[PDB]
């Protein structure tokens, strides 16, 4: 924001486990969902957690579990 | 509350009060009122940014007006009538809406921040310049009209910078962006929206005059010489040879010589050339019927003048129906009355009327021989009017446009200098040549002739010593004080407003192009047919919906989005330079050191 | 003889005070034609109007043209037939002052401004 | 009159040459401030 | 110093003239009991005051007393 639309941006890629996502139910789409909308909410945070709104790329690793913590470190 | 715009909006709610105009009620300020006051702030353009009609007639919502079933001066499509309207989502200009509100309140620091996030940058900046200029003119009497004009000029330079940045890259799309309409502003295409702000600096910058020289010289080229097109003008075969340079020619699109000839004739340059030739030949025709055809009867070569005056006077009637307001017939003639050259034209018509009555009456031929001679030069002034064209004459004749009242000043001055010694020349010497209206000759008429060469030395020359003395005295004040001192107040005043005169001619250039573009290429000898062509058309047609031959280039969604997205990327690129320009300024760098040292006084008291 | 004089002027791009001075009239060259076309039209505009009011009767073959047009430019630089050019005496004063008001004031001294300033 | 005195008093401080006075005498306050060791 | 005080007076007069010129002109021609009256316009002339008399509202008042009761707009 302070660069005032400078050329090039600091690319950031985030890696988190697919099991611990609050509102991933809307992310699943049988077809190619190039359009999509994800709304974050910090209220209904149980064992799950929300995603960040600043990372440029996201990678969601799944392992079959739901509340497992640490399924992303080895990958 | 102390702003001028609030006072204006505190009056429209009263000019259209609750009882007689906004019949239910209108004590609440609502968007139709601000749209109406903005339209007054704007010119004679289309409907302003907020919805006027029955769908959103925002004037009369305090009384229980009916719901959706009403759809007349009330709410039609919106959800509920809860002393409001509902969610009119964004009205497709949410940024310009804040920009206008910040501009009307004269918030200089706030308006620049909102302008950065604008979508239609150039149109918004140009509209802000116009509204600031015309709001400065109304009333506060000091200290803020100057500031409003300064902010208007600042926004002018701001728009010029963005346009320059967009024009440097791929000028072809920049020109196309220049003439496009803008749905978010009540179209007011940028070139048209610029003129009413009078925009000395914006119209004089580069690509603007390039586009003006592009619409003029319509389809031929910008490289061919002026002296080489006039030969192909008169020699009709000479168009078809390989001498002139078209745009159809390089694309070898010449499949019909008549078609490329139509493309040649449609250009405004040749319409102007043929009109100037017709007007140059009409004076020769009028001179023909005064040297030999001095007859008291309409001869073979006389009805041509009648039909010529019929044809040229109808051009003004065509312009009256060209782009008027559909309610004001007398309010449009005011701007015609506001042009003293139009007054000169109508006076030349009136002088023709006054001379024709002497022409048809056989007992006043001699008065008709001296009252129509001045018309030959009263038309020469008009012929000088249309020579605001040449690059070295336009900005040069704009100088004598500054000279015009001082022309009379110096005429009254020099006539009095001449008479002052024209009286004294015949006093000492005993002159005896006198007649009826010819004693006046040898008394006064021979005084001006003795200035430029016709000195009767055998008549003008005991008082020979004084004749030398006074003759040297007159030329000491005229040829020294009244000849060379004019050069000083000519040349210095030429240097004074030369930048103004250059851009004024740049600004006045579009007016000539505007008149001659929306006009058929038929000769004024053949405009007589076209004067009836739109009249027989109205025998079949009934509404004025024939065509719109204005610039007014409408664009599709697929190209509008592909162009506005391009401009926004360039607008931020321009914001890079000025933001970097401010920091590179040596004076600003004095700010950086000064406030950094102020961080040292408080940093070293922690002991 | 003068088409060769232009060539003889070409080879005078030599002198220290004339070379940079004739390079100025090299800027003048197309504007030479500009002002020639301009001033010829100013001259003709009142050369036509000079013989209109007065009743001139001197006419021949290719010499009526003389007394009609050729005597208009001669009345500019000194050759004014006052016994021929001069009831309409008041208007003859009026129009004669009008032509020289735009030429000797507007078309003579304003050239100095666009000469000297462009020289600088 | 006091309103006019605002501008000239502000005009003097806004002059770039006068701002050179402000830095020069502020640095002179640093030479005497760092000899207390 | 005389020229400095001249500019000092011109600044005060400009500040007073920008707001409500009608009272500024009336202030210009008033007498001053504290100075042996010498109304300001008269007191200015004997100093020959090149700069003060040439500033704006002074010539406006001069064009106001001349063209006494008719107008300043007519030709």
UniProtKB/Swiss-Prot annotation, chain C:
Outcome (variant: residue 56 to A): No effect on channel activity
Stretches within the membrane that do not traverse it: 69-83
Effect of residue 79 to A/E/N: Increases the permeability of Ca(2+) over Na(+)
Notes on the domains: Contains two binding sites for ADP-ribose, one in the N-terminal part of the channel and the other in the C-terminal nudix hydrolase domain. Both sites seem to have a role in channel opening, but the interaction of ADP-ribose with the N-terminal site is absolutely required for channel activation.
Gene that encodes the chain: TRPM2
Annotated protein name in UniProt: Transient receptor potential cation channel subfamily M member 2
Extracellular topological intervals: 49-68
Motif Selectivity filter mapped to chain: 77-80
Record annotation: effect of changing residue 80 to L/F: No change in the reversal potential. No change in the ion selectivity to Ca(2+) over Na(+)
Tissue expression notes: Highly expressed in brain and peripheral blood cells, such as neutrophils. Also detected in bone marrow, spleen, heart, liver and lung. Isoform 2 is found in neutrophil granulocytes.
Outcome after substituting residue 60 to A: Abolishes channel activity
Listed result of changing residue 59 to A: Mildly decreases channel activity
Membrane-crossing residue ranges in chain numbering: 1-15, 28-48, 90-111
Effect of residue 66 to A: Abolishes channel activity
Family affiliation: Belongs to the transient receptor (TC 1.A.4) family. LTrpC subfamily. TRPM2 sub-subfamily.
Localization, UniProt: Cell membrane; Perikaryon; Cell projection; Cytoplasmic vesicle
Cytoplasmic side: 16-27
Lineage of source species: Eukaryota, Metazoa, Chordata, Craniata, Vertebrata
Oligomeric form and interacting partners: Homotetramer. Isoform 1 can interact with isoform 3. This interaction decreases Ca(2+) influx through isoform 1 and suppresses susceptibility to oxidative stress-induced cell death.
